[PDB]
Design a protein around this ligand. Structure first.
Ligand SMILES: Nc1ncnc2c1ncn2[C@@H]1O[C@H](COP(=O)(O)OP(=O)(O)O)[C@@H](O)[C@H]1O
Ligand SMILES: Nc1ncnc2c1ncn2[C@@H]1O[C@H](COP(=O)(O)OP(=O)(O)O)[C@@H](O)[C@H]1O
Lengths: 155, 60, 441, 449
DNA sequence: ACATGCACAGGATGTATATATCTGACACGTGCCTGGAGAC
DNA sequence: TCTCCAGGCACGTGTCAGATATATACATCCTGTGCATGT
């Protein structure tokens, strides 16, 4: 499993280093089916995690987010990128990773704002795993473009 | 053949098991077991029976 | 489905008349051979008589003159009643056991015992099952079944409820409770409860309810040879040996005691002995150590009739160095009685090719059939019978319907008959490895 | 990624009308053999075959087995192809006719759908319930259990036989181990500790898996590719079930045994019962017996009855012999080593030697296949060696001449590198000439004659 | 000169991933009291 | 007839199967209509 996906194989290396550093990760996905696959992987490598996606009921949301923030044993939070509005605070996490990018820049921007916010203390680092030679690079361009239009007009 | 190929592409890059995952298979079985009829009858307290016989029979 | 067209899938019996023993020239596949088929008819009618020992008939003749054809005709003209056993004579030279004993087992495989005894079975759709497992256990329960006619309730013993949860009998199964043992063979599923089956495939067969009474007696007839009983009475659970060949040298006192109990079964009327046929194909591949045992295994009361086929002329006997007719020693040729065959006239060649064409369902123009008969005059039956299957496919290359001269002349062009292959070897000596030399251009 | 002797062959290279076009898909020339091999391939893919004999004659070094790999890459992956030799069947456990029939039933395949019935749960309560056990020597005996499986949606509390309990017991299933009782045999593989008992302070190196989602009584269908010889071995030495013959039969050493006629007929009737239920599909194949002249007369006797069967794969024999003596009986000589009675079954395909330009094309294809580029004068030199010495000698003078080229800083192979490799590495003919000339007398500096 | 047939314009429809909302019917918990059950 | 209590009734509640739009992208089907060709 971990080698049949190039991203997953590279995420493994990165999570081992992050763990040994004592970093805490929000890890963002654009597909909840993948959220499931991963859920497995994390069980294998025996890391503690939470989950919040569009299936996660509202008071359960409150509960999970509060955990991640209360109890530092949890290393990864698996978050669906569009799920959860503005105003979930995860500033105990110091690392964000995007397993896959959105076509819309702002949705990834709003996602990393969950770490980078008032009351954050440590320096947030944002990984972005890109599969070279595939649609993922297309996406990344098309999104940097869009961000150029935002930069030109709303300045 | 698949419809939304940009969606299909992203799935591949994520993990091939999004498509067709494997799962503890097993070797082929030649004998004659007993198939369960339905799921909605034997509710909670059921008993398994060793029903394994060979299809090769020898009649004496 | 496992009925692929072989080189003898057109023979549906010996084809001769059974009233005046006349070999009518074209019936059931065997076409043309007359005197040999009448002699095989006489041998066949004295096999079903039973009042003769194990004798020996040698089907001698040239290659591809219909010897395995006559043997397969006698095999099809007996049904699954009298045990016919084929034996190509190189299955004897084994390493699990000796060689004379491997021959003895092939004699014992062709003497059947036919006994007929009754059982009591139950048909019918299960209407419902209630089992009083309440902590309780398999103690009591009710079984309601029906046919189209009957309907009944039975109460069950503990050693029947443990067979009902063993086969998992649903409400709607078509089961066969053998009453004397307790096994349950589900014959299928009833159609009328097609909604009540969720854990089945989308494509699933369904039967109807069984017709008639629900409690009937069957007169099944079993037939097992003496080698079956020998291998059964050889180990603890030894019948697996005759499915895995791991039987060894069976001691002879077991065979003697079983030869005694079969006679005691016959004299009490409990049994009946059926002498079978043993066909030793290619009998020239036996050494003299075999013939010095076949000369005495054809002496006892319990000996099947041996039919055997030889190709060789004056050839050597294996094991020894001196030559003999048919590859057989003369003290054994005193035992056998020889049927000689003949080569085939061209019209018989034409209608044998016609039968082989109608068997594979290949359309032929009569010009192509004339050309194919002309080829078979010069290259034998096997070459033309393969040119048929090749020419159908070559006609299917260029999308044709009937084969013609333009496809038989291609099959004759690509695939050499063995005479031109011998000419090819004789005219390409220096590159083909004769014994010593390899020359590379 | 290893260039073997047969790597450039990618198929027969036939047109739509079945006409062989030369220098296509690996081969060079060889028309009358490749058209006949295409006819053989479409004879295989039409299923009107129950034993046909196809002989591949021709001298050594003319590409008899190149046609065989062309056939095996033209049929496809899902058709059985069993290549053997003539020396492979002389065994020490069984008679060689058993090895012939085992290859004949390796060459017949079957594609079967199966419905496995797993019970995939997490063990909650494991409690044995022994029965009455009077004075009979062995003592008590566990006869009934109460194992509770707990999946994600709806638990179940089931009761077991003694044999499935022994299947559990030889797997060391504690409380917490997820398992998957297979109710076809009875086998049950422990997967690991459930993640509800997870602790990073652990030492057993267990594999923690989550609770299996879905119903605890699943039912899944798969497709399986099984040959008839696999069924023969399965019913011969049993290794499935939970009784004693099928458990003490997998601790012994495995031995090839003589699967008799009765098992080979009963498995045919079982497979016909599968086909009549609309489940299994039969796909016959090829037995390629290379070097058929090594088979002795006791094997060509048995091939007659092995091909008279209503189900028998097509045989493709290869034999690079002229008029030779059969191995079994040393007093009748025949063509190819095949006996003159067995030879009439065969549809004999000839194979002719090559030409001084076809050798040049084969050298060019082999050089661009291995990855050795070179000049045209060097190609002419290697073709000159190919005409004079042998075909598969001059192909082998490309692998040192690359390395020697890389010695001298070159990339392409020139005349000097082949002119040096023809002196370092010799053929058989000049070596035998040196042998006869120098080895005049036996002694200190002689050869053992 | 008129009619019919064949391809541009660019729009509406469509495919696929979870998100963000929602609604009403079913199931379950609570409280209580009267009438179904006891038995002489 | 004197006696008891639990089954059932009224009342909340809570949740989730099928349904309402959709950001994120793009290919595709559709057919009004214009132009060209043929009669
Ligand atoms: N009388 C016949 N009728 C039909 N086919 C025949 C007859 N005689 C021979 N054949 C055919 O000729 C072929 C050779 O017969 P066979 O007995 O196999 O030759 P051999 O005796 O050399 O084994 C067989 O395939 C069979 O189909
Ligand atoms: N038509 C051909 N095209 C290309 N290479 C060939 C051809 N025929 C033979 N060869 C070469 O000859 C070599 C040996 O052929 P092979 O089949 O082993 O000879 P044999 O027929 O003696 O077994 C192979 O490496 C193959 O590359």
């Amino acid at each position: 499993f971990v080698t049949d996906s190039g991203k997953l194989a590279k995420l493994d290396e990165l999570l081992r280093e992050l763990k040994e550093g004592g970093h805490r990760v929000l890890l963002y996905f654009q597909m909840t089916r993948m959220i499931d696959l991963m859920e497995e992987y994390l069980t294998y490598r025996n890391y503690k995690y939470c989950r919040l996606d569009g299936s996660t009921k509202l008071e359960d949301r409150r509960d999970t987010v509060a955990d991640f923030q209360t109890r530092p044993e949890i290393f990864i939070f698996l978050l669906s990128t569009r799920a959860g509005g503005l105003g979930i605070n995860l500033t105990t996490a110091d690392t964000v990773i995007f397993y896959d990018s959105d076509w819309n820049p702002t949705i990834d921007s709003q996602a990393m704002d969950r770490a980078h916010r008032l009351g954050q203390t440590k320096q947030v680092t944002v990984y972005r795993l890109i599969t070279r030679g595939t649609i993922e690079e297309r996406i990344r361009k098309r999104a940097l473009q869009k961000e150029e239009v935002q930069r030109v007009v709303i300045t | 053949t698949l419809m939304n190929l940009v969606m299909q592409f992203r799935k591949v890059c994520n993990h091939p098991d999004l498509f067709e995952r494997a799962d503890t298979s097993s070797p082929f079985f030649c004998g004659h077991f007993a198939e369960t009829g339905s799921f909605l009858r034997e509710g909670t307290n059921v008993a398994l029976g060793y029903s394994t016989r060979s299809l090769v029979e020898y009649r004496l | 489905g496992l009925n692929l067209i072989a080189a003898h899938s057109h023979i549906r019996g010996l084809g001769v008349d059974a009233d005046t023993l006349e070999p009518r020239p074209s019936s059931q596949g065997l076409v043309g051979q007359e005197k040999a088929r009448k002699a095989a008819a006489v041998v066949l009618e004295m096999i079903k008589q039973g009042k003769i020992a194990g004798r020996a008939v040698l089907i001698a003749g040239p290659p591809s003159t219909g010897k395995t054809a006559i043997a397969m005709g006698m095999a099809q003209s007996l049904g699954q009643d009298v045990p016919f056993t084929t034996l190509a004579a190189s299955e004897i030279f084994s390493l699990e056991m000796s060689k004379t004993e491997a021959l003895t087992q092939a004699f014992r495989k062709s003497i059947g015992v036919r006994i007929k005894e009754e059982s009591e079975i139950m048909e019918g759709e299960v209407v419902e099952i209630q089992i009083d497992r309440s902590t309780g256990g398999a103690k009591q329960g009710k079984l309601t079944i029906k046919t189209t006619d009957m309907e009944a309730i039975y109460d069950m013993g503990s050693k029947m409820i443990d067979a009902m949860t063993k086969e998992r009998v649903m409400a709607g199964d078509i089961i066969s409770i053998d009453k004397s043992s307790g096994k349950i063979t589900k014959l299928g599923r009833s159609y009328a409860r097609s909604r009540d089956y969720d854990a089945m495939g989308v494509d699933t067969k369904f039967l109807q309810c069984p017709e008639g009474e629900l409690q009937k007696r069957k007169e099944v007839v079993h037939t097992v040879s003496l080698h079956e009983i020998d291998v059964i009475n050889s180990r603890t659970q030894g019948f697996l040996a005759l499915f895995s060949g791991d039987t060894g040298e069976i001691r002879s006192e077991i065979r003697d005691q079983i030869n005694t109990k079969v006679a005691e079964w016959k004299e009490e009327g409990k049994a009946e002995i059926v002498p079978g046929v043993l066909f030793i194909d290619e009998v020239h591949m036996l050494d003299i150590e075999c013939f010095s045992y076949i000369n005495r295994a054809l002496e006892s009361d319990l000996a099947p009739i041996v039919i055997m086929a030889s190709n060789r002329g004056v050839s050597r006997i294996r094991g020894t160095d001196y030559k003999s007719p048919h590859g057989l020693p003369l003290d054994f040729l005193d035992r056998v009685v020889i049927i000689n065959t003949h080569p085939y006239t061209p019209d018989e060649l034409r209608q044998i090719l016609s039968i082989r064409a109608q068997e594979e369902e290949v359309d032929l123009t009569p010009d192509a059939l004339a050309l194919l008969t002309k080829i078979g005059q010069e290259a034998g039956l096997r070459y033309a019978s393969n040119l048929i299957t090749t020419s159908q496919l070559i006609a299917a290359k260029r999308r044709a319907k009937q084969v013609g001269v333009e496809d038989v002349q291609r099959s004759f062009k690509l695939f050499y008959d063995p005479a031109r292959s011998v000419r090819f070897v004789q005219e390409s000596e220096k590159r083909l490895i004769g014994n010593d030399g390899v020359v590379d251009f | 990624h290893r260039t073997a002797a047969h790597t450039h062959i990618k198929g027969l290279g036939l047109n739509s009308s079945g006409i062989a076009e030369k220098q296509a898909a690996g081969f060079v020339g060889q028309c009358a053999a490749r058209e006949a091999c295409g006819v053989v391939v479409d004879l295989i893919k039409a299923h009107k075959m129950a034993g046909r004999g196809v002989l591949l004659a021709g001298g050594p070094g003319t590409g008899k087995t190149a046609l065989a790999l062309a056939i095996s890459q033209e049929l496809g992956t899902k058709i059985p192809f069993c290549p053997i030799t003539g020396s492979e069947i002389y065994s020490t456990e069984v008679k060689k006719t058993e090895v012939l029939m085992e290859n004949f039933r390796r060459a017949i395949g079957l594609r079967v759908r199966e419905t496995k019935d797993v019970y995939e749960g997490e063990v909650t309560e494991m409690t044995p319930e022994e029965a009455e056990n009077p004075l009979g020597g062995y003592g008590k005996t566990i006869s009934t259990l109460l194992i509770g499986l707990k999946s994600a949606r709806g638990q179940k509390k089931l009761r077991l036989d003694p044999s499935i309990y022994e299947a559990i017991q030889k797997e060391r299933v504690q409380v917490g181990d997820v398992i998957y009782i297979e109710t076809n045999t009875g086998a049950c593989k422990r997967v690991g500790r459930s993640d509800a008992y997870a602790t990073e302070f652990d030492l057993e190196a267990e594999e923690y898996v989550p609770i299996p989602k879905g119903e605890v009584h699943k039912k899944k269908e798969i497709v399986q590719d099984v040959t008839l010889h696999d069924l023969d071995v399965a019913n011969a030495r049993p290794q499935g079930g939970q009784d004693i013959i099928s458990m003490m039969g997998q601790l012994m050493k495995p031995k090839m045994t003589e699967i008799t006629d009765k098992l080979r007929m009963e498995i045919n009737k079982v497979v016909q019962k599968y086909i009549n239920q609309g489940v299994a599909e039969l796909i016959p194949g090829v037995l390629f017996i290379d070097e058929a002249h090594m088979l002795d007369i006791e094997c060509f006797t048995y091939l007659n009855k092995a091909l008279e069967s209503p189900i028998a794969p097509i045989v493709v024999l290869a034999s690079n012999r002229g008029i030779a003596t059969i191995r079994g009986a040393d007093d009748l000589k025949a063509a190819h080593g095949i006996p003159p009675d067995f030879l009439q079954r065969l549809l004999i395909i000839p194979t002719h030697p090559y030409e001084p330009d076809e050798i040049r094309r084969i050298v060019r294809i082999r050089a661009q296949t291995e990855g050795v580029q070179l000049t045209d004068a060097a190609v002419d030199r290697v073709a000159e060696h190919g005409v004079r010495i042998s075909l598969r000698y001059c192909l082998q003078l490309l692998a040192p001449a690359s390395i020697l080229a890389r010695v001298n800083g070159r990339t392409q192979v020139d005349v000097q590198d082949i002119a040096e490799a023809e002196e370092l590495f010799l053929d058989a003919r000049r070596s035998a000439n040196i042998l006869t000339s120098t080895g005049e007398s036996g002694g200190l500096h002689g050869f053992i004659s």
